[PDB]
Subunit: 237 residues, 2 copies
């Protein structure tokens, strides 16, 4: 079962950040985390929801294929482009096109978090009632990696390639950020970084989230997990 | 018609290399080259033949799926790993299992060079009679990029992802080297670098080959095209 790794807390203590890193080698049956309690806590996914949303976009035909171009003077974006930027409008538009009933059906098939899309079809993952844990992110990414989600293998492949963010001779990193917004310290915002690294014949799944009350701490969402994975010899510093 | 860009020749003269670079924006209908005569000349593909070989191996089920692992005590390799290193025995095994008849059929469907696979089923692209031009490489990569090759879309996407060699926020480079060896006096070897860059919503296809008689010149197969494409503002860095 998910085991606790106290050594990783040092990277959090260094920056005085409250949050969780879940890292799994080969499968979701071999995970480790610095914070047992927090690993299972559900938080708004924010832009990490672009992962299921792009898959359902393709599956429903709202996104024609991997070459779909998205309008925002306004330069158009590729699917990878729309994933990376804050194309708030892009993914708001794809969700409206998909619509409540189809979105609900796919989130139930994907076992995505609390599966609650209340709060507005074009904003539920930003302002709505949707919540998901770090553990559930890894399990979903593992299903994507194995082409086991309820979607064609071609559409899962198309989203896997669009998520590539770092390539090296030895490994490819697929990842996605997310940020709810700063909040108050009665209700701190949440920042995320989730993904997986194919290194040789091995695969590592990861999911990070943290409390964030100032936009200046945004970089930590990638530097903390990168320092941890660099320590394990998975990716370069 | 392909235009001849006289100025690119300066990157070749700088290193006293004889070669050709073909770079096309959007489709093979808008290509430029330093030398029209050599753009059409067919050369041994060497390891650039790992591209078609990987698609055919998946198409025939010799390669099970993207998660197939190959034996080299050196560790096993992934498909991306086997594509990148010299794992000549890997692709030799693949070709043997595909066999001559299916191999001939798929090279015709692919319009792959002169389609001459005579001699050994496991050495034709290494030391045999198979030859392909830089323009033909570009046409073949364009067909792969569009999923127009005679193979499933899934297998095309699996190969395209295994070819990712550089990832940046603005673009993904997919590429493949090749090197036939140093050859002889009246018959130098050939070195290649072919691929395509997906930059925003645009795509550029490229194919470079040069004569090579000394292994110390091998890195020019990437620096000459990189210099040219960076000059055109495609990848710089």
């Amino acid at each position: 079962s998910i085991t606790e790794n106290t050594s990783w807390n040092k990277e959090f203590s260094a920056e005085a950040v409250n949050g969780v890193f879940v890292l799994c080698k080969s499968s979701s049956k071999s995970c480790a985390t610095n914070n047992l309690a927090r690993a299972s806590k559900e938080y708004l996914p924010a832009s990490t929801f672009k992962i299921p949303s792009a898959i359902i976009g393709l599956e429903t035909g709202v996104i024609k294929n991997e070459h779909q171009v998205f309008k925002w003077w306004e330069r158009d974006l590729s699917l990878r482009g729309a994933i990376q930027v804050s194309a708030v409008p892009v993914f708001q538009q794809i969700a409206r096109e998909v619509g409540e009933v189809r979105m609900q059906k796919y989130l139930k098939k994907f076992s995505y978090g609390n599966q609650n899309i209340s709060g507005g079809i074009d904003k539920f993952w930003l302002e709505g009632q949707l919540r998901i844990s770090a553990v559930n992110q890894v399990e979903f990414l593992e299903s994507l990696f194995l082409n086991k989600l309820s979607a064609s293998k071609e559409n899962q492949l198309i989203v896997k390639e669009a998520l590539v963010t770092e390539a090296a001779p030895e490994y490819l990193v697929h990842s996605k950020t997310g940020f709810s917004g700063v909040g108050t310290e009665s209700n701190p915002g949440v920042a995320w970084w989730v993904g997986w690294v194919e290194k040789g014949t091995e695969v590592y799944f990861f999911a990070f989230n943290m409390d964030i009350d100032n936009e200046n701490k945004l970089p930590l969402r990638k530097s903390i997990p990168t320092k941890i994975m660099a320590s394990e010899g998975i990716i370069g510093g």
